[PDB]
Design a protein around this ligand. Structure first.
Ligand SMILES: CCCCCCCCCCCCC/C=C/[C@H](O)[C@H](N)CO
Lengths: 297, 245, 245, 50, 245
């Protein structure tokens, strides 16, 4: 039991989060109210102190004579579902016959949705995002031709054996999930849960995963979060022999049940690499367009 | 009533007569880890006054040709006082912070600094300039400590992201004709309830001049910027030998 | 609470951080014409926001050798905006005013201006100097417009009446070590409920330095005076073609 | 009739003159009252802003 | 609310815009002599407004090489006005005081003065320097009047007692960057209810610069110190011819 007064009157162990703000409903845009003229002293709503770090609480009712406007413009299309529940390209797998890419008939793809700029810049608006997903696989020939071929889409989680071939033993999918499809069918579409050991994925990780000295050898590890390495996507031509059709598998991901935290500045520079916020330092481009002078247009 | 402030935590006390206000980050004050959010079962140590107190790191000089500086948290306190021993002796760490930046100048001085908190401030590099080399930053750039590091390209924050949208995070301004202190209170921000203090840095602290310092020949040309910061609601768990990195 | 003011009328807004107060003229706020005071039977147009709004005329320079300036109302707005079209298209006119004069200077500047409202400011002349000629002022001196006119003999206000007794009308001071704005609110003052805006001017606005401007060599020598004024409770009656004079 | 809110909540047509002052009777000069010494802060009636 | 003060007593009035506060000495306001404390049986005269009013003595200059000045009470008012006639015509005297010291300077001036009230400020001398001579101060050093006297050794206050412990009496500071007036209200302090004003001085008034005055070449180098003081609750008893000493 607690006897001394500094321990009885202590705020240690206050687990309850003390919040200043509260979320209120805003199904529509705020309505404008009627305003008249103001000719007094002391009350000066146009003057702010931006050094506070807050934003201006000035409205148009206090800057001009306004009318009543009953707004019925909905804020429903700015939600995170409506902004992210839109399938976009996150992956592309090529299965050729001759060449170097994948000449054996199988292809493993380390899952990362940071290889296509248009979906990456949408997620990197936040640093933490938690969601369930819906992946869709659009398979076709280079020319776009639909051909009579069977494939197997195996999810290889981390730790499970990756297939070293088409005739491999990992393809028996006794415990790993798999999808068999013909190219003549609609694209395969499966729903995936939130599968992180953490409470949210994170597109930016300011740190190293491992302890120890950090020399130039193990500097690749900077930024790598194992909580986002969700495993491997594998694909093959179901068969003991060589296929006759070249193939491409394109992967489209749609988020659902989205939560996000901590918005960030948006990428203005061209991406260069996967899971690396590097940029071209010689060819730094300004965020927008330029002028000849500041007094013109 | 709002330009004066006294910040007392521990055995430490800051006065300011020319303040703006206090920024409480994301409208959350720092707190302790609840039993629902917790997963580790060891009892954490909660040293109230020996680690939750104001620490003063160093002093950067605001010159005309300045570009900016960043500091990474909690790397700034991993070699300092009792905090940087509990953090080395333990494996897990949880804390908020109160950052407080000081820059004094006269009434005949002009300039502005953006003082901002950027979570998970991952550091990119110029990639050889051409963008072909997949270069990486060394350890003395991602965890630079209390000395901080000088921004090479502060327009993109050395991460390809514009400085102009950085007010979407926490921030204050130090406008020398209005204020000389900038006080931000940051909670613990991570996907996990605890994490390592030596491997992972939760956020960065940017100090960038948007408006450049100017004065006429005769005034005090040394305008220092001093970083002063206090942990809040600190918690440590998982005790073993002291390792530094 | 009294040095800060925001004046909002129409689509216009003035801020001031270094004010004195607002002078409400003869303790009467502007009003509309009652049915007892009215004689004309036509319905007047009352355009609320398109004519009752702040208009900015021009900028006079306060030099060392200044003597003063006057502006005549409503002649200042008979070629400007929607007011100066309703006033030309109509025959009758009724309005109050909010005048607001701006002069900014440093804390190392000194000087004072008397900013006063003189009703029926009839302009006399030197009469040849000897007083034998019965000279008269031209039209570009009695109705000088937004450009205003420079006083020749501001001791007598070019009317034979002393400047020293001019505080018996409305006035403020602009003392540069105390204030930089002067706000006067004037009602409609005439023996009639309406009158012509092009033929008759209700009052004048004098800006005279009593104390001369002084500064040491190195300070900003251009100290502008800017007139900014808003009609109030405007009313127009008797519609016909647009005539300017 | 008036329907929109900017017209219902309008001060257009306010013919009544709003006066700040009121005339009171002064048949005699104002009397002088007894005063004593003042040695405090804040209350400073000799200082004006002309 | 606390930096502004008006002190009205009699036919006299002081304004200050840059004050600290008023010091009421030993938490006792001045009072009149009770019938229990009184021993003399004659009726005392209590002239309310002709002696209880602010008197202005003279003006000392604060130079760089200053050391300090002292004034002895009531010797400062024994040749001045109606007080210094009632005090000469009578034998007994009782009063408090309100002292008020004035020193104006700019915002580019720095310095501090200790303004203190030392009861029974007996004046010692250097004793020949060697301490063998039992020298004594002349009359123009123990009762120097309104002109005051310049301290020779202000460290020991020319009495062998340290200046540093002088805040144990009444005091204010005049810090030129904070205040320009110092107001102390002193009651009658003596072992007796009345006493002679010409033979006995109740207290002294020290004005010593602890921090020296400094300014750069171009500013006003004449920084005057002006002593202004008002009796309070004065009382005189025992009437005979006017003797000055
Ligand atoms: C036939 C079954 C196939 C199912 C495959 C679904 C894979 C599930 C993974 C979805 C989660 C992706 C989250 C990725 C995060 C980022 O790429 C990492 N932070 C890497 O930068």
């Amino acid at each position: 039991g607690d006897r001394v007064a500094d321990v009885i009157e202590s705020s240690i162990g206050d687990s309850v989060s003390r919040a200043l703000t509260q979320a209120l409903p805003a199904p529509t845009g705020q309505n404008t109210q009627v305003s008249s003229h103001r000719l007094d002293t002391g009350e000066v709503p146009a003057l702010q102190a931006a050094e506070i770090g807050a934003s201006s609480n000035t409205s148009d009712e206090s800057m001009i004579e306004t009318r009543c406007v009953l707004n019925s413009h909905s804020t429903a299309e700015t939600t995170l579902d409506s902004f992210f529940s839109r399938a976009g390209l996150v992956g592309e797998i090529d299965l050729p016959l001759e060449g170097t890419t994948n000449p054996n008939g199988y292809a493993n793809w380390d899952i990362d949705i940071t290889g296509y700029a248009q979906m990456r810049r949408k997620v990197e608006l936040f640093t933490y995002m938690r969601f369930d997903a819906e992946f869709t696989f659009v398979a076709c020939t280079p020319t776009g031709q639909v051909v009579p071929q069977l494939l197997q889409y195996m999810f290889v989680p981390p730790g499970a054996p990756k297939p070293e071939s088409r005739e491999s033993l990992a393809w028996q999918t006794a415990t790993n999930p798999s999808v068999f499809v013909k190219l003549t069918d609609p694209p395969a579409q499966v729903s995936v849960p939130f599968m992180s050991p953490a409470s949210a994925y994170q597109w930016f990780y300011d740190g190293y995963p491992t302890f120890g000295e950090h020399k130039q050898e193990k500097d690749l590890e900077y930024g790598a979060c194992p909580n986002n390495m969700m495993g491997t996507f594998s694909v093959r031509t179901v068969g003991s022999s060589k296929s006759k059709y070249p193939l491409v598998v394109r992967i489209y991901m749609r988020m659902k049940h989205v939560r996000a935290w901590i918005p960030r500045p948006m990428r203005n520079q061209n991406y260069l690499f996967k899971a690396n916020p590097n940029y071209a330092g010689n060819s730094i481009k300004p965020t927008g367009t330029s002028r000849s002078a500041i007094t013109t247009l | 009533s709002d330009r004066v402030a006294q910040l007392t935590i521990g055995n430490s006390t800051i006065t300011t007569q020319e303040a703006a206000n206090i920024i409480v980050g994301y409208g959350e004050w720092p707190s302790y880890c609840s039993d629902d959010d917790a997963t580790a079962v060891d009892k954490p140590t909660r040293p109230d006054v020996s680690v939750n107190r104001f620490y003063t790191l160093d002093t950067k000089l605001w010159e005309k040709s300045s570009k900016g500086w960043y500091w990474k948290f909690p790397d700034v306190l991993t070699e300092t006082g009792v905090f940087g021993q509990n953090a080395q002796f333990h494996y897990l760490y949880r804390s908020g912070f109160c950052i407080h930046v000081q820059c004094n100048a006269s009434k005949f001085h002009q300039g502005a600094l953006l003082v901002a908190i950027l979570p998970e401030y991952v550091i990119g590099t110029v990639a050889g300039g051409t963008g072909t080399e997949d270069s990486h930053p060394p350890y003395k750039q991602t965890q630079p400590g209390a000395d901080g590091f000088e921004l090479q390209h502060p327009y993109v924050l050395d991460a390809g992201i514009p400085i102009s949208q950085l007010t979407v995070c926490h921030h204050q301004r130090i406008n020398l004709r209005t204020n000389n202190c900038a006080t931000i209170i940051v909670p613990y921000m991570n996907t996990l309830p605890f994490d390592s203090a030596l491997n992972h840095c939760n956020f960065g602290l940017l100090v960038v001049p948007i408006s450049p310092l100017d004065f006429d020949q005769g005034a005090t040309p040394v305008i220092p910027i001093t970083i002063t910061l206090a942990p809040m609601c600190s918690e440590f768990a998982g005790l073993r030998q002291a390792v530094t990195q």
